[PDB]
């Protein structure tokens, strides 16, 4: 197809990874300026995890109970607090590798790079999409909690995800860097179900725009639709309804190709109602939904 | 189960910009030497049949502009090794990692750090195709981007980017400047040899699908190695060697599936197809995961 999942270069995030240990429980933390951010369940013993009282568990903790290390080098903790589901450990050293950064809460459909880490050491980097049911399909093993997801704009790192858990179906759930979970999930080791997932319509449209940019445009038609009519049809095919923000982020591709967003929606609606009929788009009989409009522009330009 | 690249920070710290005339690409700065594609010294009239030894002797150290960020590095020496230019600079890169230069075999995988104007832009996994192309994502100005693997803390550089072919695939050299494949750094339309599929990798990926619960493609049948290889070659799959079977052992033990039993499944898939079904999300058989890749992630 000419498109692959491309991650952002991970070096600016690698320089922020540390490990945080309580007792024998080690996960990863994010060291920015003089604060280390990590999942609050580092303070939980295995038996605390079905039903933890995080407030009670935290009042029993002192600064000197937290082992924060950059490599083998201990960073002394001088304060601690909880914000939603993340712990903030104030340390006595400002990280000299701190990048320009922002904490952003992304929307379903958006993609981000994950730097998978174990014991504070990066293992690998890969691109993830936030599914509409607020799960991601990561590759996360024991010890991966506290690994983060990010995008990089003009040397600014926008951190959007911190890893906390795996669901029964093998997908993954976590928080933003203010500790608010994506989705309805909670950091207790109880049985939780992801909602039935749906197809990320805005990304399929981006993919159709990408096909057009590359000269593959058999599926364009002379018709249009309203956004409401399209959304009611799309839901019958387990496609996500479009938001105004979706229409907005398709703006640049619409301008580049001269195909109005709602006209492309009409082409998609026909593909959904009539199927592909043996045809392919960018080489594939199936529509890709894990490339955002930004991803497409990044790879075509 | 995802394509996972190595963390790229050790390589980012080595990328610089190199300019000659109106041509700008990336270089790799290790200790006091910058490595880059020699075609940076070519113009237009040069592009179609460049006598590089002739073009290089007419250059002076000061014709080369090397920038690490916004600081210029002064070129105090230059030489050519095959298709790579080596620019000696007066400053050592303190961010130089432990490293080696390796030439990889077809079927092996590596991470690419795509860069433009000396700035890292993206990271992704590639495999060296059997026909010695790579299916990369490279635009204008990506030349000198490198591919690499990491072992312990040692960076093994295996690829430097030079060109795109009309089919959209990519070609380049090792860090000694020798091309992978029958390609030449001249501005001419070049075709690759017929590509084949990397059989040991498809098998690794089927084992990964099993580990993660996909089993619809397994079967009771068995096959000999020779008979599997007859069917493989018929479908332009690479031969599977006994070293390949040996390499797949760990994955076989973990899943309880004999290598030749998974060969029997793959034979069935090649002869029948996937019948609409998908494996790990794909309608196609994936061949850019090595056995090591699957393990290092499972
Ligand atoms: C880096 O300098 C640049 C990287 C290219 C640009 C687009 N995508 C890339 O990966 N490489 C080049 O400028 C080379 C320089 C020569 C001196 C090797 N040229 C190049 O890549 O384009 C010409 C190539 C050379 C092999 C080939 O077949 N060919 C012609 C061609 C035909 C159709 C489409 C196409 F992209 C190239
Ligand atoms: C943190 O490193 C770790 C990351 C896990 C380990 C394996 N893959 C991951 O993503 N997270 C945990 O161990 C969490 C911690 C609690 C305090 C949230 N626990 C966890 O993932 O437990 C299993 C999850 C908890 C919610 C749930 O429904 N559930 C059941 C489950 C699902 C799949 C597999 C499994 F063993 C249990």
XYZ file of C-alpha atoms and ligand atoms in Angstrom:
673
model
C 0.000 0.000 0.000
C 2.955 2.297 0.569
C 1.866 3.042 4.162
C 3.252 1.593 7.371
C 2.738 2.384 11.014
C 5.520 4.868 11.762
C 6.323 5.848 15.346
C 7.881 9.081 16.463
C 11.573 8.941 17.326
C 11.647 7.880 20.945
C 14.822 9.501 22.235
C 13.209 12.467 23.965
C 10.975 10.029 25.864
C 13.761 7.533 26.593
C 15.521 10.338 28.458
C 12.542 10.600 30.812
C 12.074 6.946 31.756
C 12.830 5.773 35.290
C 11.769 2.896 37.524
C 9.676 3.171 40.672
C 9.637 0.377 43.233
C 7.548 -0.285 46.307
C 8.733 -3.419 48.043
C 9.205 -5.960 45.260
C 6.824 -4.250 42.817
C 8.659 -2.316 40.122
C 7.053 -0.401 37.317
C 8.083 2.509 35.120
C 7.838 6.219 35.785
C 8.120 9.415 33.752
C 10.666 11.955 35.048
C 9.950 15.522 33.946
C 11.547 18.473 35.718
C 11.553 17.421 39.401
C 8.480 15.180 39.307
C 8.142 11.475 38.578
C 4.760 10.293 37.357
C 3.723 6.644 37.635
C 0.627 4.483 38.134
C -0.687 4.612 41.681
C -1.029 0.842 41.832
C 2.724 0.612 42.454
C 1.724 0.978 46.126
C -0.431 -2.134 46.037
C 0.481 -5.611 47.190
C -1.087 -8.438 45.209
C -3.751 -8.761 47.916
C -4.534 -5.017 47.856
C -5.396 -5.199 44.182
C -8.929 -6.677 44.129
C -10.359 -3.863 46.226
C -7.640 -1.324 47.017
C -8.318 1.686 49.230
C -5.751 3.919 47.553
C -6.254 6.798 49.969
C -5.730 4.503 52.952
C -2.814 2.747 51.283
C -1.147 6.092 50.522
C -1.403 7.607 53.989
C 0.709 4.700 55.257
C 3.447 5.516 52.733
C 6.340 7.870 53.348
C 8.780 9.445 50.893
C 11.518 7.064 52.073
C 9.389 4.055 51.070
C 9.683 4.866 47.335
C 12.743 3.680 45.390
C 13.068 5.788 42.230
C 15.990 4.933 39.974
C 17.359 6.208 36.700
C 19.330 3.179 35.732
C 21.018 2.112 38.960
C 21.155 5.695 40.274
C 18.658 6.446 43.044
C 16.689 9.684 42.861
C 15.641 10.852 46.309
C 11.915 11.382 46.763
C 11.020 14.541 48.700
C 7.242 14.592 48.359
C 4.375 12.488 47.124
C 0.751 13.029 46.105
C -1.984 11.277 44.152
C -3.829 12.837 41.193
C -6.676 10.561 40.107
C -4.940 7.273 39.225
C -1.340 8.574 38.992
C 1.205 9.102 41.725
C 3.419 12.174 41.572
C 6.750 11.750 43.335
C 8.640 14.982 43.844
C 12.382 14.276 43.590
C 15.377 16.364 44.543
C 16.846 16.486 41.018
C 15.381 18.162 37.960
C 15.772 15.877 34.935
C 18.368 17.520 32.637
C 16.909 15.635 29.683
C 13.398 17.077 30.181
C 12.020 18.037 26.749
C 9.546 20.711 25.955
C 6.326 18.891 26.809
C 2.559 19.026 27.200
C 0.055 16.655 28.763
C -2.803 16.091 26.309
C -5.914 13.958 26.502
C -6.479 12.469 23.082
C -9.705 11.420 21.416
C -10.666 7.947 20.225
C -9.206 7.337 16.796
C -6.076 9.332 17.470
C -2.791 7.514 17.163
C 0.309 7.778 19.307
C 3.649 6.115 19.797
C 4.235 3.812 22.756
C 7.716 3.336 24.216
C 7.384 -0.092 25.803
C 9.586 -0.222 28.910
C 10.542 -2.737 31.580
C 12.401 -1.846 34.779
C 12.883 1.637 33.408
C 14.632 0.365 30.271
C 13.075 0.901 26.836
C 12.326 -2.240 24.860
C 10.656 -0.981 21.694
C 8.514 1.659 20.073
C 5.367 1.235 18.040
C 2.310 3.121 16.894
C -1.096 2.524 18.577
C -4.580 3.786 17.865
C -7.039 4.629 20.628
C -10.067 2.503 19.780
C -13.582 3.956 20.099
C -14.151 1.739 23.156
C -11.107 3.427 24.800
C -8.745 0.450 24.578
C -5.502 0.048 22.677
C -3.952 -3.013 21.056
C -0.532 -2.812 22.641
C 2.209 -5.364 23.148
C 2.477 -5.082 26.925
C 3.956 -7.693 29.265
C 4.362 -7.899 33.030
C 6.344 -4.897 34.252
C 5.223 -2.602 31.414
C 2.953 -0.349 33.485
C 4.035 3.238 33.438
C 5.157 2.996 29.823
C 3.812 6.066 28.041
C 2.265 7.032 24.738
C 3.122 10.297 23.047
C 3.155 12.428 19.910
C 5.927 14.854 18.974
C 5.151 18.255 17.393
C 8.168 20.446 16.533
C 10.385 19.027 19.293
C 7.454 19.299 21.781
C 6.444 15.978 23.330
C 2.692 15.673 23.951
C 2.264 12.852 26.449
C -1.199 11.285 26.126
C -1.107 7.798 27.671
C 0.280 5.909 30.641
C -0.176 2.168 30.789
C -2.037 0.454 33.662
C -3.721 -2.835 32.718
C -4.855 -5.600 30.374
C -8.446 -6.644 29.820
C -9.709 -10.229 29.391
C -9.764 -9.927 25.583
C -6.048 -9.057 25.647
C -6.422 -5.338 24.864
C -4.986 -2.619 27.091
C -6.285 0.302 29.160
C -4.710 3.274 30.902
C -4.840 6.962 31.761
C -3.708 10.320 30.521
C -0.853 11.936 32.429
C -3.307 13.626 34.797
C -4.333 10.125 35.820
C -7.832 10.053 34.291
C -8.613 6.722 32.655
C -9.648 6.558 29.032
C -12.978 4.804 29.083
C -15.010 3.556 32.043
C -12.201 1.437 33.495
C -10.805 1.370 37.046
C -7.419 0.324 38.414
C -8.583 -2.661 40.391
C -7.850 -6.265 39.489
C -11.510 -7.110 38.830
C -13.197 -8.415 35.673
C -13.853 -5.555 33.261
C -15.198 -5.647 29.736
C -14.304 -3.353 26.903
C -17.347 -2.143 25.014
C -17.939 -3.703 21.625
C -15.478 -1.990 19.345
C -16.364 -0.056 16.229
C -14.528 1.077 13.113
C -12.832 4.474 13.231
C -14.706 6.252 10.460
C -12.557 9.383 10.457
C -9.467 7.281 9.830
C -11.147 5.299 7.056
C -11.955 8.587 5.380
C -8.325 9.631 5.805
C -7.351 6.377 4.133
C -9.691 7.065 1.189
C -8.138 10.520 0.843
C -4.711 8.832 0.874
C -5.875 6.523 -1.925
C -7.039 9.541 -3.941
C -3.710 11.331 -3.404
C -1.997 8.249 -4.886
C -4.297 8.153 -7.912
C -6.614 5.336 -6.747
C -10.023 6.957 -6.974
C -12.491 4.553 -8.588
C -14.800 4.872 -5.560
C -15.480 8.620 -5.871
C -19.063 9.498 -6.920
C -21.090 12.571 -7.936
C -23.263 12.508 -4.785
C -23.092 13.952 -1.267
C -24.812 13.393 2.069
C -25.567 15.225 5.262
C -23.524 14.369 8.299
C -26.621 13.178 10.124
C -27.714 10.859 7.300
C -24.196 9.447 7.062
C -23.949 8.850 10.808
C -27.241 6.946 10.940
C -26.097 4.707 8.109
C -22.589 4.260 9.471
C -23.877 3.019 12.842
C -25.730 0.209 11.055
C -22.333 -1.041 9.834
C -20.609 -0.737 13.261
C -18.804 2.413 12.120
C -18.343 5.279 14.570
C -20.437 8.393 13.970
C -18.494 11.435 12.895
C -18.099 14.466 15.113
C -17.571 18.053 14.096
C -13.949 17.694 15.210
C -13.589 14.760 12.780
C -14.882 16.881 9.939
C -12.419 19.577 10.985
C -9.325 17.363 11.068
C -10.150 16.099 7.577
C -9.891 19.715 6.378
C -6.321 19.578 5.126
C -6.866 16.387 3.074
C -10.121 17.758 1.710
C -8.266 20.884 0.593
C -5.358 18.890 -0.847
C -7.683 16.713 -2.994
C -10.550 19.148 -3.508
C -13.034 16.519 -2.365
C -15.440 17.874 0.229
C -15.617 15.840 3.416
C -19.340 15.098 2.981
C -18.751 13.968 -0.609
C -16.159 11.515 0.633
C -18.692 10.392 3.230
C -21.081 9.653 0.377
C -18.427 7.515 -1.322
C -17.801 5.641 1.897
C -21.516 5.100 2.456
C -21.709 3.476 -0.977
C -18.775 1.205 -0.180
C -20.515 0.184 3.049
C -23.890 -0.437 1.406
C -22.595 -2.052 -1.787
C -19.288 -3.523 -0.683
C -16.065 -3.640 -2.644
C -17.197 -6.163 -5.290
C -13.754 -7.668 -5.773
C -12.031 -4.290 -6.037
C -9.142 -3.025 -3.936
C -8.126 0.321 -2.485
C -4.396 0.926 -2.130
C -3.942 -2.780 -2.805
C -6.263 -4.049 -0.092
C -9.815 -5.341 -0.098
C -10.245 -4.061 3.432
C -10.384 -0.508 4.703
C -7.697 0.599 7.132
C -8.808 2.526 10.225
C -5.545 3.075 12.170
C -4.090 5.946 10.080
C -5.248 9.403 11.122
C -5.497 12.375 8.798
C -2.231 13.611 10.318
C -0.584 10.208 9.773
C -1.533 10.321 6.103
C -0.134 13.800 5.575
C 3.025 12.807 7.500
C 3.718 9.907 5.106
C 2.577 11.490 1.812
C 4.380 14.828 2.489
C 1.113 -8.353 18.103
C 2.739 -5.314 16.465
C 5.754 -4.375 14.381
C 8.057 -3.036 17.059
C 11.076 -0.871 16.343
C 14.113 -0.496 18.572
C 14.185 2.687 20.654
C 15.899 5.210 18.416
C 17.507 7.640 20.856
C 21.046 6.313 20.560
C 20.835 6.881 16.794
C 19.077 10.286 16.971
C 22.110 11.631 18.786
C 24.227 10.821 15.749
C 22.188 12.433 12.973
C 23.465 15.578 11.285
C 22.822 17.521 8.092
C 25.333 17.484 5.198
C 25.165 19.941 2.303
C 27.108 20.232 -0.938
C 25.863 22.874 -3.354
C 22.061 22.702 -3.572
C 21.950 19.079 -2.355
C 21.141 18.375 1.295
C 20.831 14.999 3.008
C 21.586 13.385 6.372
C 24.831 12.097 7.824
C 25.739 9.746 10.671
C 28.232 11.290 13.136
C 30.268 8.700 15.048
C 33.278 9.899 17.050
C 34.956 12.393 14.655
C 33.656 11.024 11.328
C 30.433 11.792 9.446
C 29.157 9.104 7.071
C 26.758 9.963 4.256
C 25.815 8.938 0.720
C 28.403 10.081 -1.758
C 25.803 11.294 -4.235
C 25.538 14.464 -2.127
C 28.430 15.652 -4.334
C 26.372 15.352 -7.526
C 24.391 18.066 -9.407
C 21.928 17.455 -12.256
C 24.395 17.110 -15.132
C 26.192 14.725 -12.742
C 23.246 12.511 -11.882
C 22.978 10.306 -14.978
C 26.572 8.944 -15.092
C 28.631 10.268 -12.156
C 32.348 9.545 -12.158
C 32.531 9.804 -8.398
C 36.327 9.587 -8.116
C 36.492 12.515 -10.560
C 33.842 14.544 -8.723
C 35.472 13.881 -5.365
C 38.968 15.006 -6.331
C 37.510 18.374 -7.436
C 36.023 18.948 -3.955
C 37.642 20.707 -1.018
C 36.892 20.154 2.658
C 35.211 23.576 2.764
C 32.703 22.632 0.043
C 30.998 20.348 2.600
C 28.632 22.017 5.076
C 27.960 19.799 8.108
C 25.550 21.003 10.777
C 24.716 19.384 14.115
C 21.602 21.317 14.949
C 22.681 24.908 14.399
C 26.418 24.390 15.036
C 28.589 23.873 11.987
C 31.212 21.134 12.253
C 34.405 21.919 10.390
C 35.422 19.257 7.871
C 39.171 18.584 8.217
C 39.328 15.572 5.907
C 37.292 13.503 3.460
C 37.514 10.105 1.809
C 35.230 7.758 -0.091
C 34.523 4.102 0.727
C 32.426 2.544 -2.008
C 29.206 4.581 -2.147
C 29.712 6.263 1.275
C 31.536 9.510 1.887
C 33.435 9.804 5.175
C 33.935 13.381 6.402
C 36.469 13.843 9.219
C 35.391 16.699 11.489
C 37.226 18.616 14.215
C 34.692 17.724 16.929
C 33.929 14.350 18.464
C 30.325 13.376 19.103
C 30.017 12.703 22.858
C 26.714 10.953 22.185
C 28.414 8.238 20.071
C 27.084 4.870 21.259
C 28.879 1.589 21.363
C 28.383 0.382 17.796
C 29.369 -1.894 14.952
C 28.830 -1.952 11.219
C 27.186 -5.161 10.059
C 25.968 -6.362 6.707
C 22.625 -8.066 7.142
C 21.242 -11.095 5.243
C 18.031 -11.065 3.256
C 15.128 -11.881 5.539
C 16.667 -10.132 8.555
C 14.864 -7.143 10.040
C 16.089 -3.784 11.304
C 14.739 -0.468 12.494
C 14.827 2.593 10.251
C 15.173 6.117 11.634
C 13.822 8.307 8.873
C 15.381 11.773 8.955
C 15.115 15.009 6.973
C 17.614 17.898 7.189
C 19.450 16.104 9.946
C 16.291 15.867 12.091
C 14.720 12.532 13.100
C 11.169 12.197 11.799
C 9.991 8.618 12.314
C 10.980 5.087 13.274
C 9.735 1.794 11.847
C 10.738 -1.817 11.188
C 11.798 -3.038 7.747
C 13.168 -6.291 6.412
C 15.871 -6.783 3.844
C 13.850 -8.317 0.965
C 15.239 -11.426 -0.752
C 15.682 -9.211 -3.850
C 17.658 -6.743 -1.665
C 15.148 -3.927 -1.713
C 13.399 -2.623 1.363
C 9.790 -1.521 1.552
C 10.466 1.753 3.279
C 8.791 5.069 3.768
C 11.304 7.576 2.450
C 10.693 10.943 0.826
C 12.896 13.584 -0.782
C 15.782 14.394 1.555
C 15.700 11.068 3.458
C 19.082 9.938 2.092
C 21.565 9.118 4.805
C 18.840 7.867 7.111
C 20.111 4.622 8.649
C 18.834 1.252 9.677
C 20.015 -0.562 12.758
C 19.503 -3.194 15.441
C 20.395 -2.918 19.127
C 22.006 -5.675 21.199
C 22.580 -4.939 24.866
C 23.630 -1.308 24.494
C 25.481 -1.844 21.170
C 24.027 -0.309 17.998
C 24.581 -2.440 14.900
C 24.220 -0.197 11.857
C 23.225 -2.178 8.792
C 21.686 0.216 6.252
C 22.083 3.697 4.815
C 19.428 5.038 2.514
C 20.232 6.095 -1.084
C 17.372 5.720 -3.584
C 13.797 4.862 -4.561
C 12.847 2.612 -7.417
C 9.901 3.188 -9.758
C 7.839 0.532 -7.962
C 8.083 2.581 -4.767
C 10.516 0.312 -2.916
C 13.924 1.487 -1.687
C 17.597 0.648 -2.026
C 20.755 1.497 -0.192
C 24.035 0.331 1.231
C 25.659 -1.029 4.314
C 27.865 1.392 6.254
C 30.837 0.281 4.215
C 29.045 1.770 1.210
C 28.288 -1.499 -0.613
C 24.815 -1.719 -2.065
C 22.375 -4.371 -1.130
C 21.303 -5.692 -4.514
C 22.247 -4.991 -8.084
C 21.722 -1.246 -7.757
C 23.874 1.739 -8.604
C 23.883 5.317 -7.286
C 23.078 6.947 -10.600
C 19.815 8.713 -11.503
C 18.412 6.009 -13.796
C 15.270 3.880 -13.565
C 16.265 0.575 -12.005
C 14.234 -2.574 -11.495
C 14.877 -5.206 -8.889
C 14.901 -8.904 -9.387
C 11.732 -10.825 -8.726
C 10.972 -10.760 -5.051
C 10.108 -13.803 -3.028
C 8.434 -14.230 0.343
C 10.520 -14.859 3.500
C 9.244 -18.287 4.532
C 10.951 -18.585 7.926
C 9.370 -15.241 8.863
C 5.876 -16.228 7.730
C 6.218 -19.281 9.925
C 7.384 -17.175 12.882
C 4.329 -14.966 12.397
C 1.959 -17.949 12.266
C 3.448 -19.088 15.593
C 2.809 -15.592 16.938
C -0.800 -15.851 15.797
C -1.113 -19.119 17.712
C 0.439 -17.701 20.901
C -2.176 -14.936 20.787
C -5.053 -17.410 20.234
C -5.408 -17.610 16.443
C -5.544 -21.287 15.404
C -8.050 -21.496 12.555
C -5.306 -22.250 10.005
C -3.651 -25.212 11.805
C -4.336 -28.727 10.527
C -3.686 -32.426 11.149
C -1.592 -32.898 8.004
C 2.170 -33.209 8.022
C 4.819 -32.670 5.387
C 8.417 -33.444 4.793
C 10.841 -30.567 4.549
C 11.624 -31.323 0.920
C 7.971 -31.505 -0.116
C 7.151 -28.292 1.706
C 10.048 -26.621 -0.124
C 8.730 -27.831 -3.496
C 5.412 -26.128 -2.805
C 7.142 -23.047 -1.399
C 9.273 -22.532 -4.493
C 6.177 -23.011 -6.636
C 4.630 -20.002 -4.877
C 7.846 -17.900 -4.960
C 8.560 -18.475 -1.269
C 12.205 -18.795 -0.212
C 13.510 -22.248 0.675
C 13.357 -23.270 4.329
C 16.666 -24.685 5.562
C 17.414 -26.947 8.498
C 18.982 -23.942 10.236
C 15.594 -22.229 9.808
C 13.842 -25.198 11.353
C 16.380 -25.174 14.174
C 15.806 -21.430 14.628
C 12.079 -22.011 15.002
C 12.520 -24.562 17.798
C 11.870 -22.229 20.717
C 8.631 -21.126 19.087
C 7.754 -24.753 18.382
C 8.365 -25.830 21.975
C 6.409 -22.895 23.397
C 3.311 -23.747 21.342
C 3.661 -27.518 21.061
C 3.539 -27.341 17.260
C 6.236 -29.106 15.298
C 7.939 -26.919 12.730
C 6.949 -29.262 9.904
C 3.386 -29.243 11.192
C 3.326 -25.450 10.814
C 4.810 -25.937 7.347
C 1.809 -28.126 6.581
C -0.522 -25.300 7.684
C 1.316 -22.797 5.520
C 1.176 -25.156 2.549
C -2.591 -25.333 3.021
C -2.866 -21.535 3.176
C -0.819 -21.122 0.016
C -2.900 -23.650 -1.904
C -6.347 -22.633 -0.622
C -5.940 -19.042 0.510
C -7.386 -17.498 3.619
C -11.041 -17.761 2.519
C -11.872 -14.254 3.700
C -10.444 -14.964 7.156
C -7.622 -12.864 8.576
C -4.623 -13.672 10.751
C -3.570 -11.153 13.415
C -5.656 -8.592 11.519
C -4.135 -9.187 8.077
C -5.669 -10.486 4.858
C -2.134 -11.344 3.718
C 0.667 -13.533 5.024
C 3.143 -11.313 6.858
C 6.834 -12.005 6.262
C 8.696 -9.141 7.990
C 8.790 -10.653 11.500
C 11.755 -12.887 12.213
C 11.709 -15.661 14.803
C 13.816 -13.423 17.079
C 11.321 -10.563 16.567
C 8.371 -12.712 17.623
C 10.172 -14.064 20.683
C 11.573 -10.709 21.839
C 7.920 -9.628 22.024
C 6.295 -12.817 23.403
C 17.997 11.057 -1.323
O 18.962 11.899 -1.931
C 16.966 10.581 -2.327
C 15.880 9.741 -1.645
C 14.737 9.386 -2.594
C 13.921 10.574 -3.087
C 12.494 10.052 -3.181
N 12.489 8.918 -2.263
C 13.705 8.490 -1.941
O 13.959 7.514 -1.237
N 17.621 9.808 -3.382
C 17.960 10.328 -4.564
O 17.868 11.529 -4.812
C 18.545 9.376 -5.608
C 19.909 9.920 -6.022
C 20.658 9.118 -7.082
C 21.977 9.803 -7.429
C 20.891 7.699 -6.607
N 17.658 9.208 -6.753
C 16.434 8.678 -6.570
O 16.106 8.077 -5.577
O 15.626 8.784 -7.658
C 16.071 8.241 -8.922
C 15.967 6.734 -8.796
C 17.328 6.039 -8.860
C 16.909 4.572 -8.956
C 15.641 4.641 -9.755
O 15.078 3.705 -10.315
N 15.295 5.940 -9.833
C 14.361 6.468 -10.818
C 12.948 6.651 -10.322
C 11.876 6.468 -11.180
C 10.576 6.644 -10.736
C 10.323 7.009 -9.434
C 11.393 7.191 -8.605
F 11.162 7.558 -7.316
C 12.693 7.027 -9.014
C 1.421 -3.352 35.121
O 2.768 -3.599 34.746
C 0.495 -4.463 34.653
C 0.451 -4.602 33.129
C -0.231 -5.893 32.672
C 0.613 -7.138 32.904
C 0.275 -8.054 31.739
N -0.213 -7.132 30.718
C -0.532 -5.937 31.186
O -1.011 -5.006 30.524
N -0.847 -4.206 35.167
C -1.438 -4.974 36.088
O -0.917 -5.987 36.543
C -2.828 -4.553 36.549
C -2.762 -3.860 37.909
C -4.115 -3.585 38.565
C -3.950 -2.953 39.942
C -4.986 -2.711 37.681
N -3.713 -5.692 36.661
C -4.190 -6.353 35.598
O -3.959 -6.090 34.436
O -4.952 -7.373 36.054
C -5.752 -8.144 35.135
C -6.912 -7.285 34.675
C -7.359 -6.250 35.708
C -8.697 -5.794 35.123
C -9.213 -7.038 34.459
O -10.358 -7.243 34.053
N -8.214 -7.933 34.463
C -8.426 -9.355 34.235
C -7.396 -10.007 33.349
C -7.451 -9.844 31.977
C -6.509 -10.444 31.158
C -5.503 -11.217 31.693
C -5.468 -11.368 33.047
F -4.482 -12.129 33.595
C -6.394 -10.798 33.885
